[PDB]
């Protein structure tokens, strides 16, 4: 190779493959020894002056250096990395804010040990989109809406490549099936001294929704004791308040609620928790 003062090269190989590592432009009948991480190898894996590796695994990656026989004079260096070809990515778009834009996440099912390159292209019919990204994460560009009730479906495609292969995937959807708000926060329960079988339950709206007045939501309330394991399902109308009348006398409870728009979207995840027992007269 080049001068021994150089940095080692980067060479990627497959898992279970076979590859030979020569000592640069040296001859075949030259005295050459190899060392991995400072440990010398056995002469059984040397085909003259080259290094022959059979059955590459995850433990064969590292710094392979070429030295003179029984010496510390460096000749050639190379960094070997073992990885797998990429698989079909898992693309999923979600509209956390219906009046505003949406976002799309993607990830590989089987992890790879080498860096990857991703490129996403979003189409609204025959037009082009930019999807300027502003997240704290990556692998998202947050496509922003421009028209409403356009009846035209969106097309998103993400392509991934590697030093050993490449792959791509694409999905299609509308502007209504990807709508899913965030669960409400600070769901607190309070006792009621006025009634024996009562519990004050009040929640809020998700902070991500910028325009809730023009697009109301429907809440699904679930209240259940801690020992019966029999959950109850009660769907509510417009409002962030409820009143239960058939709860326990003294035992604890867990109440969780979700959110969903009036005509579009899907049901959201449940809230964190709730714990309160009704008042006891003594």
């Amino acid at each position: 190779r080049h001068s021994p003062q150089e940095a080692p090269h980067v060479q990627y190989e497959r898992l279970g493959s076979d590859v030979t590592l020569p000592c640069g432009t040296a001859n075949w009948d030259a005295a050459v020894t190899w060392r991995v991480n400072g440990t010398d190898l056995a002469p059984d894996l040397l085909n003259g002056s080259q290094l022959v590796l059979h059955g590459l695994e995850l433990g064969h990656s590292g710094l392979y250096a070429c030295f003179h026989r029984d010496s510390w004079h460096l000749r050639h260096q190379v960094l070997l990395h073992v990885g797998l070809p990429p698989r079909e990515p898992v693309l999923s778009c979600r509209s956390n804010t219906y009046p505003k834009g949406f976002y799309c996440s993607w990830h590989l099912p089987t992890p790879t040990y080498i860096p990857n390159t991703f490129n996403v292209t979003v189409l609204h019919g025959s037009k082009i989109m930019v999807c300027e990204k502003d997240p704290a994460l990556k692998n998202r560009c947050h496509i922003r809406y421009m028209h409403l009730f356009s009846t035209i479906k969106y097309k998103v495609s993400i392509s991934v490549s590697n030093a050993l292969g490449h792959n791509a995937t694409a999905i299609t959807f509308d502007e209504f099936t990807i709508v899913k708000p965030d669960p409400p926060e600070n769901v607190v329960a309070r006792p009621v001294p006025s009634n024996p079988r009562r519990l004050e339950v009040t929640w809020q709206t998700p902070s991500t929704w910028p325009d809730p007045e023009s697009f109301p939501l429907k809440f699904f309330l679930r209240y259940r004791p801690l020992i019966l394991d029999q959950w109850q399902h009660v769907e509510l109308s417009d409002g962030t308040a409820h009143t239960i009348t058939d709860a326990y006398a003294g035992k604890e409870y867990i109440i969780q609620v979700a959110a969903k728009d009036n005509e579009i979207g899907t049901w959201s995840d449940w809230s964190v928790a709730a714990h309160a027992t009704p008042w006891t007269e003594e």
Partner: antibody
Amino acid sequence: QVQLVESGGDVVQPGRSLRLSCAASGFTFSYYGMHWVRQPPGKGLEWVTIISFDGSQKYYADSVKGRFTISRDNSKNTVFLQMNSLRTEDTGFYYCAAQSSTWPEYFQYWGQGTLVTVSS
Amino acid sequence: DIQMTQSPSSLSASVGDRVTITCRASQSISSYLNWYQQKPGKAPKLLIYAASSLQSGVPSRFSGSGSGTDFTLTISSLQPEDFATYYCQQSYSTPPITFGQGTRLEIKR
């Protein structure tokens, strides 16, 4: 007993391409790497290219990069050098040499060389 | 990358004298230097490899010393069959292999 002969050199205009031939003998041609050093009239030596003993690594100089191509056949022990887009400044004696197997590496064997005159 | 500088470019001396040739490099090379001898009308011939090791069949009058950045090619007693051009070649960075500008020896009168 090691002999190195060259062929394929005479006057050629800068508009045509040439190809050199280097036949090795007296040693194991498949175990040694072949070099190419040229020398213009009235000047010093100048390395051109280098090919591996098997034929996997090929390196060229920036002065002839993109125009020259080196190849070799270990069966017939012949070295080829496809010289394309010749010019007058490429005039000089080309030498066929082989590197050494010891450390450090050096030029052990040499040939008589051939003349390549390039003028319109 | 590495540029070789010889000194001087031409030297005139009589037979039996001590001639010293210097070859300077552009960076620090341990011992990767080779000395060649090229006569007018013939191919160059290696004299000393590794700048200190004489090749088989070379008279003992030739010698070589120096390392790191400066080297030295010295001849004990000059002979009539020693007047030729000498080059120094580095074997540290490949590619490219760089040679010196040459040092031609002449007869003194």
